[PDB]
Amino acid sequence: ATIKKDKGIDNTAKIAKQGYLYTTNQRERLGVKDGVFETRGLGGKRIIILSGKDGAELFYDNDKVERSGTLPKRVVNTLFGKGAIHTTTGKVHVDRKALFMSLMTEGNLQYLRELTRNHWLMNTQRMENMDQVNVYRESIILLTKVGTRWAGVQAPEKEIENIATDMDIMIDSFKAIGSAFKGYRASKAARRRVEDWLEDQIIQTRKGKIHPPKGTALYEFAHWKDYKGEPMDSRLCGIDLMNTFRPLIAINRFIAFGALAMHENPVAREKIKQDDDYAYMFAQEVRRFYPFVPYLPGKVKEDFQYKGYDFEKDTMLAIDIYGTMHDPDVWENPNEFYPERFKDWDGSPFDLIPQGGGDYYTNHRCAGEWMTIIIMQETMKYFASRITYDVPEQDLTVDLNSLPGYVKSGFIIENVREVVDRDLEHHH
Amino acid sequence: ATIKKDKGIDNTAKIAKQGYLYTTNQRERLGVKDGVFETRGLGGKRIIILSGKDGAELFYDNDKVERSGTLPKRVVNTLFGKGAIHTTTGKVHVDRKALFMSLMTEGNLQYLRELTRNHWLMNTQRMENMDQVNVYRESIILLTKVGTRWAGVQAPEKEIENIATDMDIMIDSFKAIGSAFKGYRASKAARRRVEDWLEDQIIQTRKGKIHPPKGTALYEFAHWKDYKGEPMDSRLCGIDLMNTFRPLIAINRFIAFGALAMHENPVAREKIKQDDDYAYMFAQEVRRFYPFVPYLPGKVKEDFQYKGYDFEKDTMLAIDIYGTMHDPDVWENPNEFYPERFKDWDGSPFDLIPQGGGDYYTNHRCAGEWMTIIIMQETMKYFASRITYDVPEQDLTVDLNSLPGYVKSGFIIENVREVVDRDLEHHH
Ligand code: HEM
Ligand code: HEM
Ligand SMILES: CCCCCCCCCCCCCCCCCCCC(=O)O
Ligand SMILES: CCCCCCCCCCCCCCCCCCCC(=O)O
C-alpha cells in the first residue's frame, strides 16, 4: 500500500506541542488502522511511526531495525552521556549489556528491596514533622540515598540534594527531543558534575584507594573488561555507571503518579493494603497508564515489507511507546486505571513497554525494569499502608500535551502520620 | 537456727568495694549453704541477704515482704525519681503498674521490634564510615532515637546525644547504693533536664497543643486517671513517663555485653546467624551471665520463719540478683556462657531474675522485660548477621568488684561492613 502521512516539510514543533497525544491525534485524523503512519521531523527527515504489539515486535527485530545513530544528539548529551550503552550496537552492545544485567541478581535485587523499605520506614518521622510534603521532590531525595547505596558509590549527606537536583535536571532534559532549549546548558552542567564525581569514584577504586563491595555497580564497572579484554576508560566508565542509578532516581516520576492514582481511586488503596499481588499490579498499571516515555527512535537496517508497505534502508523509524500502551486493541478501556487487567496479561514483551520492549540481552530494553518494579511495589505498599495523610487543594493536572509527564503540583500531601496498631492484643 | 553474719558495725563500704562478688564472697567464707546470711549497712541497719530460687520466691511474697521505703533515697533521687512507681505500694502500686503493663501490647511490642531492626539497618553506613565504633556509646544514641519514637515524645536530632548522655548518667548512678558521690549532683541535673522536657510534653498533650498517637506512653500517661479518678500531676507524670524509656536506653549495657559474648564465643555468632531461637537464648544468657542488677532491697512485712530462722517485722532484706543467677544449685556451670542451657529452662519466675522476679502485675518486677528481650534479640541478630567487623586491641575487662558492670573499653569495633549476598542468583 502507501503509508498515510501527516503532511509538512518538518513537523518537529507540532510533535513537541502535542506531546504524548501527537501519534494518536494523527492516527485518528488520518484514519489509520494498521498502526503505521509517516511524518517529517528532526530537520526534514522521513519518520515512520510504528504502534501496537506487532509494531513493537517489528521494531525490536534485530534483522529489520538498527538503533545506533538514531537518538538526537542533544538527548544523548544530557540524558545518557556520550559513548553510553544506549549508543552502542552489535557485539559491543551485547557485551556491555551483559555487564549491566549481571547486576540484576536475586541477591542484589533483594538488597534493593530492603533499602527501599527501610528508607521509607525511616523517613516517616521527617515527613510527620513537615507541614507539607511534595511527594515528587521527597521521592527524589529518598531514591538518591537508596541508589547511591545500592551502587556502592559515596554520597555524604550534604551532597544528596545537590545530586538529586542534578539527577532531576538530566531526566527532564529529553523534553526537547533533539532541540536546544532553555535549560540545555544547565542540564549539561548537572551531567558533568555527576560524571566527574563518578569518574573519580572509578579511579579511586582502580588505584585501591576506596573499596566498594564486590557485586556493586561501582566495583563491577571499575573492574570489568570487554570482550577484547579492555576496561572502559574512566570517563566512559563513570558515564555508564551513572546509567545504573540516575534512571533509578527517575522512578520519582512514577511514584508521584502512583500517589495520584491512589488518590483518584480510593478502592485501590484498601486493596494494596490487603494483598501484595494487587500492589504489584497497581505498580504495573501506573507504568502503563501514566505518560513517561513517548516513543523511541531507530532506523531500517535493510529493506523489508510490513503490512504491505515498503521499508527502505536508513529510513528513520519510531516505536510509539505511550500510544501502544493506550491502544484499545492492545489494552481494553486503555484510559481507565484498572490494575486487575493484569490478571489477564500474558507477559508479552511487546505490549507493556513503558521502558522498552523486546529482549533484555539482545535488545536495548531497560536493564532496570525489575529494579523499577521492586521499588514501585515497595513504595506503593508504604504509602497505602504505613502512613495516612491529607491531600490539600492543588493542581493535580497531568498535561498530556507537555513532555515530560508530570503531576503539575508534584502531588502535595500533609498531615502525614504513621499507621501503627498499638492496641492490637493477642485476644484480637 | 541462728543466721550467719558478716561482722561489722556497718559494712557498706566493704559491700561497695567488692561489688557483684560481695554476697558470694561472704557465703563461701562463712560456709552458708541455705542461701541466707546477715550483715549491717546503710548506717548500721541489720540486712538479711536472701538468695536462690526459694530466696527469690520468699522475697516476692507480698504477705512476708514489704517494698516501700527500702530503696536508699539518693538512688530514688537519681535513678527512678521521687514519687516513681518503684516507690509505690499496695493499691496505688497495682493501679499504676497496670498503666505501665497496658503499653506492653503485642502491637506496640511489634512496633518496638520494627523500630529496632530498621534503626540498626539504617545505622550501618554511618558505622562503616567511622574509623572505630564504641558499641556501648553507639547503642545508647541508637536506643535514644528508638525509645523516644516508641514513647511518642519529641526529640529532634540535635537533642538526641544530649538526652543520651543524660540517660547514661542516670542509669550509672545506682553505683553509690545510697551514698553521695562524685557525680551525685551531675546525675540530679541530668534527671531534672529530662524530667522538665517530659513534663512539658505532658502539659502540651493535656492542653491539646501536641498530639501523640493513641497507645503511646506519652498519650496514655497524659490521659490516665488513677483508681480514685485522678490524673497524675504533671511532674510525677513526667517522672513515670521517663521510667518508660530511660531503662530502655539502659539496654546499651547488655548490648555491649552481648557483643563481647559473641567475641569471646565465636561459635555463638555462627549459631545466631542460623537460628532465631538461639538468638533469643543468647540474649537470655547475656542477661544471666553479665553483671547489672546486684541485689534489691525490701523489708519484713510481718513476722515469719524461713528455713528455721526468725524474721522480725521491719528487718531490712535484700534479694541477691547477681548471686542467685550465678549459684551452681540454680544454674549448672554458672560462670560458663552457655545459651543452650535455656533448652532445659522451665520459665520459673524466680531464677532468671536480672530485672526482678515474681509477678509483673502484683510485684515490682520490671515492666519492660519483654521489651528488653525484643531489643536484645533484634540487636544481636543484627550484629551477628548483618555486619562484619574487627575487634581491635583493647581492655575488655569486666571488673566484677566495681558497680556497675561495664566492659572497660565499652567494646570497640572497627572495619564495619554490611553483609549482602549480591552474587546470590536463583541457580544457587
Ligand atoms: C530503576 C533503575 C533503572 C536502571 C538501572 C535502568 C537502566 C537502563 C539501561 C542500562 C538502559 C540501556 C540498555 C541498553 O541500551 O541495552 C535503559 C534503557 C531504557 N530505559 Fe531504563 N533504567 C532504570 C529505570 C528506568 C525508568 C524509571 C524508566 C522510565 C520510563 C526507564 C526507561 C528506559 C527506556 C525507554 C529505555 C530505552 C529502551 C530502548 O532503547 O529500547 N528506565 N535503562
Ligand atoms: C526496656 C524497657 C524497660 C522498661 C519499660 C522498664 C520498666 C520498669 C518499671 C516501670 C519498673 C518498676 C515496676 C514496678 O515498680 O512495679 C522496673 C523495675 C525494674 N527494672 Fe526495668 N525497664 C526496662 C528495662 C530494664 C533493664 C535493661 C534493666 C536492667 C537490669 C531493668 C531492671 C529493673 C529492675 C531490677 C527493676 C526492679 C524490680 C523490683 O523492684 O523487684 N529494667 N522496670
Ligand atoms: C514521532 C516520532 C518522533 C521521534 C523523535 C525521536 C526522539 C527520541 C526521544 C527519546 C526519548 C527517551 C525517553 C527516555 C527517558 C528515560 C528516563 C530514565 C531512563 C533512562 O535514563 O534509561
Ligand atoms: C548486700 C545488700 C545491700 C542492699 C543495698 C540496697 C541498695 C539497693 C540498690 C538498688 C540497685 C538498683 C539497680 C537498678 C538498675 C536498673 C537500671 C535500669 C532499670 C530501671 O531503671 O528500672
Numbering used by the authors:
A (entry chain B), B (entry chain B): 2 to 429
Kindly provide excerpts from the paper associated with this entry:
Cytochrome P450 CYP152s catalyze decarboxylation of fatty acids to generate terminal alkenes, valuable compounds for various industries. Here, we identified, overexpressed, and characterized a new CYP152 enzyme from Lacicoccus alkaliphilus (OleTLA) and compared its biophysical and biochemical properties with the well-studied OleTJE from Jeotgalicoccus sp. 8456. The enzyme can bypass the use of redox partners to supply electrons by efficiently using H2O2 as a co-substrate via a peroxide shunt pathway, enabling a convenient in vitro bioconversion process.
The X-ray structure of OleTLA in complex with icosanoic acid revealed a unique flipped heme and a substrate tunnel configuration which are different than those of other CYP152 decarboxylases. Although the overall architecture of OleTLA: C20FA is similar to that of OleTJE: C20FA, we noted distinct differences between the two enzymes. Significant distinctions were observed in the FG-loop region (residue 173–175 of OleTLA) and the β-sheet (residue 388–391 and 413–419 of OleTLA) at the C-terminal. The electron density in these regions, particularly at the FG-loop region, was less defined, indicating greater flexibility in the OleTLA structure compared to OleTJE. OleTLA is notably different from OleTJE and almost all other CYP152s in its heme orientation. The cavity sizes of OleTLA and CYP152N1, which have unusual heme binding, were measured as 2693 Å3 and 2637 Å3, respectively, whereas OleTJE which has normal heme binding showed cavities of 1149 Å3. Three tunnels of OleTLA including the main substrate tunnel pointing towards the FG-loop (residues 173–184) and the loop with residues 61 to 83 while four tunnels of OleTJE including the main substrate tunnel pointing toward other two loops (residues 60–71, and 80–83) were identified. We further analyzed Chain B of OleTLA which binds C20FA in comparison to the C20FA binding in OleTJE. In both structures, almost all residues surrounding C20FA are similar in the two enzymes except V76 (I74 in OleTJE), Y296 (F294 in OleTJE), I178 (L176 in OleTJE), I50 (V48 in OleTJE), and I16 (V16 in OleTJE). Notably, I178 in the FG-loop of OleTLA (equivalent to L176 in OleTJE) exhibits a shorter distance to C16 atom of C20FA than does L176 of OleTJE.
